[PDB]
């Protein structure tokens, strides 16, 4: 089994333009959305079929009530922040919590806040402390650190409860999350410029989206032009990596593709 992650986001927008919700919260297992909630629906509902089939109506009613209060909480904290900054108008407040179950059985945990797209407060579950970015953040830090039992509860949730949810959700959708579709890799060449030939290594139809593709001349690694891992829309992903050929060079290039613990080499 490879590395998996659970994530919960929160987006707070003061003075939102009509149509944009004041509060949005989405959960993720790896790259798949699993839950959703906003201030317009005021209901928490699943975003994946294998989440609705395995979670009783009890789960969604309980967390609909919980997030309604969290939405209220997020409003006053953002209002408090704008008060401290003496900020008017629209500003954003963000929060992300989650954990990862690494491949070797190891675990990680994180809890961060953001104000206007910048790192605001980062939690350190080892030292039981909050990393503050500026003076107003440090004011929030001292208030949160005064509640020592809360830091412990968050440490326990990150290291124990979050991982418990992650393993549970992995089993619910193991057909989607733990599957493997290897990439279809093809190397082609085109003359972009006069006297300039380019080699293109293109991969598509692979899942999970985690993939790394490099070009290698002989045994060494010039600069390599990379393409982003883009979602194809059918559940798979695509990416590419290109290089510029030296025509007088008698060297041989080869595309290397690694995916789900499988290394692949395409000589030219």
């Amino acid at each position: 089994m490879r590395t998996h992650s659970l994530r919960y986001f929160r987006l707070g927008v003061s003075d939102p333009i009509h149509g944009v919700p004041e509060f949005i919260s989405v959960g993720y297992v790896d790259s798949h959305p699993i839950t959703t909630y906003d201030s317009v629906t005021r209901q928490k509902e699943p975003r994946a079929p294998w989440m609705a089939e395995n979670l009783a109506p009890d789960h969604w009613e309980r967390y609909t009530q919980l997030l309604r209060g969290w939405q209220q909480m997020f409003k006053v904290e953002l209002k408090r922040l704008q008060r401290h900054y003496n900020h008017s108008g629209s500003h954003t407040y963000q929060r992300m919590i989650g954990c990862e179950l690494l491949e070797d059985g190891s675990t990680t945990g994180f809890l961060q806040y953001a104000y206007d797209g910048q790192d605001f407060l980062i939690f350190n579950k080892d030292t039981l402390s909050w990393l503050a970015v500026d003076n107003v953040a440090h004011t929030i830090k001292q208030a949160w650190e005064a509640n020592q039992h809360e830091l412990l509860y968050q440490k326990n949730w990150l290291e124990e409860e979050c991982i418990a949810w992650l393993k549970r959700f992995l089993e619910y959708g193991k057909d989607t999350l733990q599957r493997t579709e290897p990439p279809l890799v093809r190397v082609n060449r085109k003359e972009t410029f006069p006297g300039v030939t380019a080699l293109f290594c293109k991969a598509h139809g692979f899942y999970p989206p985690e993939i790394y593709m490099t070009w290698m001349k002989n045994g060494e690694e010039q600069e390599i032009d990379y393409g982003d891992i883009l979602p194809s829309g059918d559940g798979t992903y695509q990416a590419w990596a290109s290089i510029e050929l030296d025509p007088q060079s008698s060297n041989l290039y080869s595309c290397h593709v690694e995916h789900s613990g499988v290394h692949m080499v395409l000589q030219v």
Partner: antibody, heavy 109, light 116 residues
Framework: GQNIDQPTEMTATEGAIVQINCTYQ??????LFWYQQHAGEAPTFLSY??LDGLEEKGRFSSFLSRSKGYSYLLLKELQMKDSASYLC??????????WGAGTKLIIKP | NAGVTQTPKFQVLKTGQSMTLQCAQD?????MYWYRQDPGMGLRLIYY???????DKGEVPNGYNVSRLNKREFSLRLESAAPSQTSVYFC??????????????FGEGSRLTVLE
């Protein structure tokens, strides 16, 4: 389903030491609470444990073992006022509070 | 702060009667709860108000109703009393329902006795 077990009643003599055990089987764990409730009055908060270890505030101590699903409330230097019912409560994975039936502590003079 | 005050301290009703329990806290808490305490069992949640603008049923909500009038007040109501509703009703308030380490603050308690 979710279960919490306290001894129904315990008796000790003043000046001594009593230990009230609390074992719990819950769906997830977000902390264990101890509450004191005197006869005919309101429960008041005593302690909170979410990590393994022993927390001590004054004559009262609270220990937690998440592995064994076990906790105890330790009262040192017993006094007649300590005679009360002691409530054990656990928060489950959905932050719901499961309550034990409570332990009626009786202090003999 | 005055804590949590609930009324009435005592009450006796006939089976058909209706009655409302009042509760309010001045600690600017956002969570409000209504428990009932009975011999030989832990506290049972009747209803709770996680925030100012929402309530939900608890474990034993049959025969009860609540109305979070505002952030400061929570009221428990019985439109048709029952001998089974003879109990001691406690009102609690927490700072936030979501935060895990938060404790409860209880009211003095209301003793109800319903007779035929």
């Amino acid at each position: 389903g979710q279960n919490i077990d306290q001894p129904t009643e315990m008796t000790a003599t003043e000046g001594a030491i009593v230990q009230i055990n609390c074992t719990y089987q819950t769906s997830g764990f977000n902390g264990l609470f101890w509450y004191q409730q005197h006869a005919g009055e309101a429960p008041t908060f005593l302690s909170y444990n979410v990590l393994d270890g022993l927390e001590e505030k004054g004559r009262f101590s609270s220990f937690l073992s998440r592995s064994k699903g076990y906790s105890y409330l330790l009262l040192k230097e017993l006094q007649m006022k300590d005679s009360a019912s002691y409530l054990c409560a656990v928060k489950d994975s959905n932050y719901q509070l499961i309550w034990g039936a409570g332990t009626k502590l009786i202090i003999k003079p | 702060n005055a804590g949590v005050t609930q009324t009435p301290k005592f009450q006796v009703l006939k089976t058909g009667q209706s009655m409302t329990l009042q509760c309010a806290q001045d600690m600017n808490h956002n969570s409000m709860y209504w428990y009932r305490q009975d011999p030989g069992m832990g506290l049972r949640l009747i209803y709770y108000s996680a925030s100012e603008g929402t309530t939900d049923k608890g474990e034993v909500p049959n025969g009860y109703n609540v109305s979070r009038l505002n952030k400061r007040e929570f009221s428990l109501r019985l439109e048709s009393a029952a001998p089974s509703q003879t109990s001691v009703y406690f009102c609690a308030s927490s700072v936030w329902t979501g935060e895990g380490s938060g404790e409860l603050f209880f009211g003095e308690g209301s003793r109800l006795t319903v007779l035929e």
